[PDB]
Ligand binder design. Structure first.
Ligand code: SF4
Ligand SMILES: [Mg+2]
Ligand SMILES: [Mg+2]
Ligand SMILES: [Mg+2]
Ligand SMILES: [Mg+2]
Ligand SMILES: [Mg+2]
Ligand SMILES: [Mg+2]
Ligand SMILES: [Mg+2]
Ligand SMILES: [Mg+2]
Ligand SMILES: [Mg+2]
Ligand SMILES: [Mg+2]
Ligand SMILES: [Mg+2]
Ligand SMILES: [Mg+2]
Ligand SMILES: [Mg+2]
Ligand SMILES: [Mg+2]
Ligand SMILES: [Mg+2]
Ligand SMILES: [Mg+2]
Ligand SMILES: [Mg+2]
Ligand SMILES: [Mg+2]
Ligand SMILES: [Mg+2]
Ligand SMILES: [Mg+2]
Ligand SMILES: [Mg+2]
Ligand SMILES: [Mg+2]
Ligand SMILES: [Mg+2]
Ligand SMILES: [Mg+2]
Ligand SMILES: [Mg+2]
Ligand SMILES: [Mg+2]
Ligand SMILES: [Mg+2]
Ligand SMILES: [Mg+2]
Ligand SMILES: [Mg+2]
Ligand SMILES: [Mg+2]
Ligand SMILES: [Mg+2]
Ligand SMILES: [Mg+2]
Ligand SMILES: [Mg+2]
Ligand SMILES: [Mg+2]
Ligand SMILES: [Mg+2]
Ligand SMILES: [Mg+2]
Ligand SMILES: [Mg+2]
Ligand SMILES: [Mg+2]
Ligand SMILES: [Mg+2]
Ligand SMILES: [Mg+2]
Ligand SMILES: [Mg+2]
Ligand SMILES: [Mg+2]
Ligand SMILES: [Mg+2]
Ligand SMILES: [Mg+2]
Ligand SMILES: [Mg+2]
Ligand SMILES: [Mg+2]
Ligand SMILES: [Mg+2]
Ligand SMILES: [Mg+2]
Ligand SMILES: [Mg+2]
Ligand SMILES: [Mg+2]
Ligand SMILES: [Mg+2]
Ligand SMILES: [Mg+2]
Ligand SMILES: [Mg+2]
Ligand SMILES: [Mg+2]
Ligand SMILES: [Mg+2]
Ligand SMILES: [Mg+2]
Ligand SMILES: [Mg+2]
Ligand SMILES: [Mg+2]
Ligand SMILES: [Mg+2]
Ligand SMILES: [Mg+2]
Ligand SMILES: [Mg+2]
Ligand SMILES: [Mg+2]
Ligand SMILES: [Mg+2]
Ligand SMILES: [Mg+2]
Ligand SMILES: [Mg+2]
Ligand SMILES: [Mg+2]
Ligand SMILES: [Mg+2]
Ligand SMILES: [Mg+2]
Ligand SMILES: [Mg+2]
Ligand SMILES: [Mg+2]
Ligand SMILES: [Mg+2]
Ligand SMILES: [Mg+2]
Ligand SMILES: [Mg+2]
Ligand SMILES: [Mg+2]
Ligand SMILES: [Mg+2]
Ligand SMILES: [Mg+2]
Ligand SMILES: [Mg+2]
Ligand SMILES: [Mg+2]
Ligand SMILES: [Mg+2]
Ligand SMILES: [Mg+2]
Ligand SMILES: [Mg+2]
Ligand SMILES: [Mg+2]
Ligand SMILES: [Mg+2]
Ligand SMILES: [Mg+2]
Ligand SMILES: [Mg+2]
Ligand SMILES: [Mg+2]
Ligand SMILES: [Mg+2]
Ligand SMILES: [Mg+2]
Ligand SMILES: [Mg+2]
Ligand SMILES: [Mg+2]
Ligand SMILES: [Mg+2]
Ligand SMILES: [Mg+2]
Ligand SMILES: [Mg+2]
Ligand SMILES: [Mg+2]
Ligand SMILES: [Mg+2]
Ligand SMILES: [Mg+2]
Ligand SMILES: [Mg+2]
Ligand SMILES: [Mg+2]
Ligand SMILES: [Mg+2]
Ligand SMILES: [Mg+2]
Ligand SMILES: [Mg+2]
Ligand SMILES: [Mg+2]
Ligand SMILES: [Mg+2]
Ligand SMILES: [Mg+2]
Ligand SMILES: [Mg+2]
Ligand SMILES: [Mg+2]
Ligand SMILES: [Mg+2]
Ligand SMILES: [Mg+2]
Ligand SMILES: [Mg+2]
Ligand SMILES: [Mg+2]
Ligand SMILES: [Mg+2]
Ligand SMILES: [Mg+2]
Lengths: 137, 208, 96, 122, 99, 82
RNA sequence: CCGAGGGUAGGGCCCGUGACUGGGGCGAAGUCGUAACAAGGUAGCUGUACCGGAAGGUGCGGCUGGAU
RNA sequence: GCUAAUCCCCCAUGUGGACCCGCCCCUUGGGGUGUGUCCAAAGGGCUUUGCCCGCUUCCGGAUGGGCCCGCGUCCCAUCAGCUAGUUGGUGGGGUAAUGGCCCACCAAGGCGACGACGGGUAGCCGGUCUGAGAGGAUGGCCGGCCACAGGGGCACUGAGACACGGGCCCCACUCCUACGGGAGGCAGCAGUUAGGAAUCUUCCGCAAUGGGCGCAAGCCUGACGGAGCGACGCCGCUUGGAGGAAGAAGCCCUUCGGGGUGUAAACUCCUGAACCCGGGACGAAACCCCCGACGAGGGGACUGACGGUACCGGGGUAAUAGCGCCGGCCAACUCCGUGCCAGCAGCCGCGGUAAUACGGAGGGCGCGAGCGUUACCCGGAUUCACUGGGCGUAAAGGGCGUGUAGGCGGCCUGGGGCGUCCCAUGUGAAAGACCACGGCUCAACCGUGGGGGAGCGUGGGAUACGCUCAGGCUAGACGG
């Protein structure tokens, strides 16, 4: 594996398209900090440190919409969209003043900064920029 | 300069009465009140559905043909309104209104803007004292638009003031009759005039 | 078909003349001093070196040599002469 | 391509090719007619189009079209040209400007006279 | 201030002079990605104290010769032949890039 | 030498000078060192003159030379009042 | 001493042009056959080789983008 | 062959400065000091025991420059290897000064796929044009820098030049003569000519601003301030305005009943571009004179190319319209004529006897002293795709491995803090642009003010991620 972070976001995105109750990602002290923001901003029901075959994992409990009317009774997503911004191929750095407003306000840009993992809102609050991790809505 | 031609053919194309003459406009000898159909050999032929473009051409031509103004100056104002803060439609309409020849016609000094121009053009008008012969002058709030006294004692101004005793003039305008002098109070809200023009469509014309 | 620039040209020829005349004498003496300083003749070496040194700074007063050129020239004159005299010696005058 | 592939080779700025080489940068070029004749056009048309061979001041010699009904062009006639092909006449990439030099305007034009170099009648 | 760069000595075949290879990173103006670029400087070493593989600092200086505009500042590290290899192999590969 | 003089701006039959410190060898409307005031000979505005008298004295102190018709605009601006 | 340049000699790159010649494009109302599209009347296409007025044919191996 | 000086040289004095040797601080040749040595100078004018302008030597300031470094700056790899002053050293030469800039010698190096070398094109920037932005294109005018002065080389004088209207030499060209000999350098303002699609008056003025010289009066100023010309561009304005037939003639259409041009005209009143007369600038108050003290200050006067123009006041005539288009895109439709002809054409396509597509007419549309065309730039083009594209059959996976450089890389804990982010700070000239106000009667144009950013130098700060160093783990990988 070459991008641990992206893999997680992809594990989540894929798992939500079939409405899994939960899903497992290989653990990391940085993946957690991200997952923390993901839970507080209300994208996921939460997470917990599990083990798979003696190996550390993070189990993520997925959150969806209500049962729906019509031919497609599939509920809406809570995470409609999640994808890497910065990459190993190309590191994306933004100063505070150039931090983008995800979906006119309805979504967040998770960012890694020299003052912890913050959202776009929090970055302007704390007054710092950094590597743009991903955007989610 | 301006259009300077047969003016009733305009209204007949627009499908609306544009009150471009003054007196004759209200008479039943009006072009529209006799023939409400387009000028020329094919005016009575049953019209086919006007293209999306056609609709916006007309509305711009309408608003422009109202003011008897050249397309350049029309364009330039629109642009100035396109850069300037706020609802572009409002600022454009206001700027078109703030023209001296228009203010002169609005305060009732003349029967037609066409006539209102020559009054400005021939020095018969003044602002805050000084004489102005420029139909394009940008009227601001606080401008005292008066008739030059050397032009006060003239028939054509009298006849036209003799109609301005009790005619009410917009919420943005004041007037002192007899003394032949009025004032521009503020920029006309879109509410202040009910011109036969959906000005949103004018913006959309220029966005091509 | 003419100016006072022709006048300005004329002056240059005379100043060139006076310039070349001083600078040659310097080189002639400086080497003369250096000459003696090798086969010292320590007195005669220093004796000439003074006359060269003098002519250097006297040319420096005018448009001949710039201040730093005279200084540059002198620094090289003394250094060569003394070290020439460091073989055998010994400096019979000043100097120094 | 990968981002890396872009850093290495970059993108390729593709140039435009002039359609009027004989002009050599200019808006118009003066020439002299060598041959003045008629040429049959390609399908699906059929006619006798009026065409001139002109040798330019750019050193070039190109074939030029003669617009309008009738003309006063002949050998040695001095002529000015402008751009624009005549699709149906392969090898014709230029039009002769009427009303310039030895090229007179069209007799009896009333509509669109500027494009046919005809003075306004009284 | 007088510009100071850190680089590896890749040649000591000159007398009183060494070649100091300095590297640098920066985001590509259009493409964002962080890219590496390097440049060789000929540096003045009056005592010939520095060896092949020494990671050193150089300061910009008054002209010493042609092409020599830097003097060596200080020894930073000794014995990084692993870097000289990276440099040398690239040069060697050039004999396989010809025709 | 370094000087303080008027560099014409404005337009044709519409003079408008900027008082300024710049090299005598400069072209008049050329690059200057620092602007230290403005001036309108046509007097079309309430204050057709103004001068940073604080600054205009600094350069003067260090060897700047004013033009004659600038000395006027500097005296009137009270730089020469002792 | 170096030196603008001139001169002698031999190289390199480019441009223009040349009897004649190779194919290419368009023109089209000519000539010859009918190779391809249907199982196109010998399934086609293919690399290569040899052959023939011309499309093409055939050998060898390959593909199905082949009908039945 | 005579002669003066602020021309030139000699001695002196040495505040000081210059040099070698020594030494203290400093740290590249910075500052101080001691011995030795070396170095100055010019007088002129008025009101005359006093001023003014000068002159000499030295220190500092300010301003304008030289040189050096980091990063940034187009196309071709069908240019892949380049290099003997070449790379470095020692010692000199040279300069204001560093330097192979130059010489001698010694070493054998220097550069190159991060594109050397070679070829092609281009003066670079502030900015300009376009574009939602990113980006693309561009460098005319105005400002900054460079380079050049018929083609080349060289130095002289000088603070500064290797000097557009200074010098020498070679070349090409042209010219002049008395045929014996000599001269020139408009890429300065005008102007001529050739070239070309094409680009201006052999004008006026030093009154204004700036510049050179002088104590000053003042003199010079094709810089400049203006004028002339050209719709080349932008902007303002004009060819009128009100009234005026169920509607003249003319012409077009027609079902022959009528429909159109069209309130358009005619005609009525009203105004008054042009023009005629009168007055007539802002731009010009300095220098200078007077007193004061030649200063501070106060008081006096001279001068306007534009120009009797603008403009203000009086009189006063209804007074230029053109160009493109009307098949679809794309706004505007009918008749005649032609008959795959003549012709139109940006693309699709029109015309072979019923053409809104050709030519003419009427009518209509769009702009308007302009309208159209050609050429080029950007846009539409998300059609080189960073923003923001693709590769089973549409154009596109290399025939397959192995591997160099390069690119990218698992979990944990530390140190560094390079990337990265924050703050402070300097720079980011002016003009342009953006916002506000103001001056021309408006605008164009122009003045005053305001907001800034990138990017780099500097100091301080942070440590999540990328980096680096260090120590661990076993999920990847490999081995038994
Ligand atoms: S009369 Fe006035 S309103 Fe009636 S048509 Fe003629 S112009 Fe329009
Ligand atoms: Mg992105
Ligand atoms: Mg106009
Ligand atoms: Mg109305
Ligand atoms: Mg707006
Ligand atoms: Mg009302
Ligand atoms: Mg637009
Ligand atoms: Mg003289
Ligand atoms: Mg001699
Ligand atoms: Mg000299
Ligand atoms: Mg000197
Ligand atoms: Mg010719
Ligand atoms: Mg046809
Ligand atoms: Mg064309
Ligand atoms: Mg026409
Ligand atoms: Mg050296
Ligand atoms: Mg003066
Ligand atoms: Mg030679
Ligand atoms: Mg030679
Ligand atoms: Mg020769
Ligand atoms: Mg051939
Ligand atoms: Mg042939
Ligand atoms: Mg077959
Ligand atoms: Mg067959
Ligand atoms: Mg067959
Ligand atoms: Mg075969
Ligand atoms: Mg054969
Ligand atoms: Mg046969
Ligand atoms: Mg056979
Ligand atoms: Mg087979
Ligand atoms: Mg099949
Ligand atoms: Mg005497
Ligand atoms: Mg003496
Ligand atoms: Mg004097
Ligand atoms: Mg040396
Ligand atoms: Mg060299
Ligand atoms: Mg040598
Ligand atoms: Mg050797
Ligand atoms: Mg490099
Ligand atoms: Mg390349
Ligand atoms: Mg060339
Ligand atoms: Mg270029
Ligand atoms: Mg060039
Ligand atoms: Mg775009
Ligand atoms: Mg240009
Ligand atoms: Mg320029
Ligand atoms: Mg030259
Ligand atoms: Mg020359
Ligand atoms: Mg010459
Ligand atoms: Mg010339
Ligand atoms: Mg001098
Ligand atoms: Mg010099
Ligand atoms: Mg010369
Ligand atoms: Mg030069
Ligand atoms: Mg000249
Ligand atoms: Mg000169
Ligand atoms: Mg004779
Ligand atoms: Mg002679
Ligand atoms: Mg001459
Ligand atoms: Mg000229
Ligand atoms: Mg000329
Ligand atoms: Mg000519
Ligand atoms: Mg000619
Ligand atoms: Mg001019
Ligand atoms: Mg003057
Ligand atoms: Mg003076
Ligand atoms: Mg003169
Ligand atoms: Mg003159
Ligand atoms: Mg004009
Ligand atoms: Mg009727
Ligand atoms: Mg009628
Ligand atoms: Mg009629
Ligand atoms: Mg009729
Ligand atoms: Mg009328
Ligand atoms: Mg005045
Ligand atoms: Mg005077
Ligand atoms: Mg006074
Ligand atoms: Mg007059
Ligand atoms: Mg009058
Ligand atoms: Mg009258
Ligand atoms: Mg009339
Ligand atoms: Mg058009
Ligand atoms: Mg049709
Ligand atoms: Mg239509
Ligand atoms: Mg009929
Ligand atoms: Mg016919
Ligand atoms: Mg046509
Ligand atoms: Mg038919
Ligand atoms: Mg017909
Ligand atoms: Mg037609
Ligand atoms: Mg057409
Ligand atoms: Mg035009
Ligand atoms: Mg384009
Ligand atoms: Mg693009
Ligand atoms: Mg992309
Ligand atoms: Mg595509
Ligand atoms: Mg793929
Ligand atoms: Mg494959
Ligand atoms: Mg192969
Ligand atoms: Mg590797
Ligand atoms: Mg790495
Ligand atoms: Mg990592
Ligand atoms: Mg770490
Ligand atoms: Mg850091
Ligand atoms: Mg600025
Ligand atoms: Mg104003
Ligand atoms: Mg401003
Ligand atoms: Mg901005
Ligand atoms: Mg800043
Ligand atoms: Mg750390
Ligand atoms: Mg480790
Ligand atoms: Mg394993
Ligand atoms: Mg195993």
């Amino acid at each position: 594996l070459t991008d641990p972070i992206a893999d997680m976001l992809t594990r989540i995105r894929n798992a939500t398209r079939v409405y899994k109750e939960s899903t497992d990602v290989p653990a990391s002290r940085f993946k957690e900090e991200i997952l923390r923001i993901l839970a507080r901003e209300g994208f996921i029901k939460g997470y917990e440190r599990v083990d798979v075959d003696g190996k550390p994992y993070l189990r993520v409990y997925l959150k969806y919409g209500p049962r729906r009317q019509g031919p497609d009774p599939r509920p809406e997503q809570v995470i409609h969209h999640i994808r890497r911004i910065s990459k190993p191929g190309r590191r994306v750095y933004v100063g505070v003043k150039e931090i983008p407003r995800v979906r006119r306000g309805l979504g967040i840009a998770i960012l890694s900064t020299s003052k912890g993992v913050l959202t776009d809102r929090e970055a302007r609050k704390l007054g710092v920029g950094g590597e743009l991790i991903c955007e989610v809505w | 300069g301006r259009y300077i031609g047969p003016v009733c053919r305009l209204c007949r194309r627009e499908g609306v009465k544009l009150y471009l003459k003054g007196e004759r406009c209200y008479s039943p000898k009006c072009a529209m009140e006799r023939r409400p159909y387009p000028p020329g050999q094919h005016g009575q032929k049953r019209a086919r559905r006007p293209s999306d473009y056609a609709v916006r051409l007309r509305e711009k031509q309408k608003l422009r043909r109202i003011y008897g103004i050249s397309e350049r100056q029309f364009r330039n104002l629109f642009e100035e309104a396109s850069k300037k803060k706020g609802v572009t439609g409002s600022v454009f309409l206001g700027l078109l209104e703030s023209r001296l020849d228009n203010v002169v016609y609005r305060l009732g000094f003349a029967v037609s803007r066409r006539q209102a121009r020559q009054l400005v053009r021939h020095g018969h008008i003044t602002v805050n004292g000084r004489r102005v012969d420029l139909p394009s002058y940008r009227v601001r709030p606080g401008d005292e638009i008066a008739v030059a006294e050397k032009s006060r004692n003239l028939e054509l101004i009298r006849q036209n003031l003799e109609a301005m005793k009790g005619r009410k003039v917009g919420p943005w305008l004041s007037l002192d009759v007899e003394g032949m002098k009025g004032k521009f109070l503020r920029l006309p809200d879109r509410e202040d005039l009910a011109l036969p023009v959906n000005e949103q469509l004018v913006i959309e014309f220029y966005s091509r | 078909r003419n100016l006072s620039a022709l006048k300005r040209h004329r002056q240059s020829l005379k100043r060139r003349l006076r310039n070349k005349a001083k600078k040659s004498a310097i080189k002639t003496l400086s080497k003369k001093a250096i000459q003696l300083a090798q086969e010292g003749k320590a007195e005669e070496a220093l004796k000439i070196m003074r006359k060269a040194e003098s002519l250097i700074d006297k040319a420096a007063k005018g448009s001949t040599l710039h201040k730093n050129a005279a200084a540059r020239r002198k620094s090289r004159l003394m250094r060569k002469v003394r070290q020439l005299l460091e073989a055998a010696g010994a400096p019979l005058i000043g100097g120094g | 391509p990968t981002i890396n592939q872009l850093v290495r080779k970059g993108r390729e700025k593709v140039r435009k090719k002039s359609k009027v080489p004989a002009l050599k940068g200019a808006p118009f070029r003066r020439g002299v007619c060598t041959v003045v004749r008629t040429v049959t056009p390609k399908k699906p048309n059929s006619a006798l189009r009026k065409v001139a061979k002109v040798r330019l001041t750019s050193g070039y010699e190109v074939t030029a079209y003669i617009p309008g009904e009738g003309h006063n062009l002949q050998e040695h006639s001095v002529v000015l040209i402008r751009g624009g092909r005549v699709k149906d006449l392969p090898g014709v990439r230029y039009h002769i400007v009427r009303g310039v030099y030895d090229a007179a305007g069209v007799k009896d034009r009333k509509k669109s006279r500027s494009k046919y170099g005809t003075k306004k009648p009284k | 201030p007088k510009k100071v760069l850190t680089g590896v000595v890749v040649s000591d075949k000159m007398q009183k002079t060494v070649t100091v290879l300095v590297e640098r990173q920066f985001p590509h103006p259009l493409y964002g990605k962080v890219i590496k670029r390097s440049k060789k400087y000929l540096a003045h070493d009056p005592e010939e104290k520095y060896k092949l593989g020494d990671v050193v600092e150089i300061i910009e200086s008054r002209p010493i010769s042609k092409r020599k505009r830097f003097r060596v500042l200080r020894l930073v590290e000794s014995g990084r032949m692993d870097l000289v290899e990276k440099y040398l192999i690239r040069r060697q590969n050039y004999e396989s890039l010809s025709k | 030498m370094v000087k303080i003089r008027l560099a014409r701006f404005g337009s044709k039959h519409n003079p408008h000078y900027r008082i300024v410190v710049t090299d005598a060898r400069r072209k008049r409307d050329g690059k200057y060192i620092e602007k230290i005031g403005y001036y309108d000979p046509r007097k079309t505005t309430p204050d057709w003159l103004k001068v940073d008298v604080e600054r205009a004295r600094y350069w003067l102190s260090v060897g700047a030379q004013p033009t004659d018709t600038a000395r006027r605009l500097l005296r009137q601006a009270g730089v020469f009042r002792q």
